[PDB]
Design a binder for these strands. Structure first.
Length: 49
DNA sequence: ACGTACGCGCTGTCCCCCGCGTTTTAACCGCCAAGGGGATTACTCCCTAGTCTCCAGGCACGTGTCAGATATATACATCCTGTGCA
């Protein structure tokens, strides 16, 4: 979440997003929730609830 | 008025840094998070000098005196002139 290419690619003009990855990690929910943030900006910052 | 010789114009030389293509490295980012000490703000004593004060004294000023420069007697000192001679 704290990288520069995070906010560098967020403000682009698009109507759809598609993420192509092999497999994410099971634990460490901050990066899974971060991929949920980059999917669409509707998720709140609470991942511990 | 003279003069002469160096600034200037011209010509030949050669060489050295610019233009461009190819090689190599400095720095920003991702990871992966932590602390750290030094100016800042606030507070709290504490004691050195401003201010007032009076007592003393010392360097600018006036005068004494020698150092150095100056103008003038002076004892010889070199031409000139009578002057006597062989």
């Amino acid at each position: 979440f704290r990288s520069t290419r995070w906010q560098a690619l967020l403000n682009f003009n698009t109507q759809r997003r598609l993420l192509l990855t092999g497999t994410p990690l099971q634990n460490n929910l901050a990066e899974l929730w971060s991929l949920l943030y980059f999917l669409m900006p509707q998720t709140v910052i609470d991942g511990k609830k």
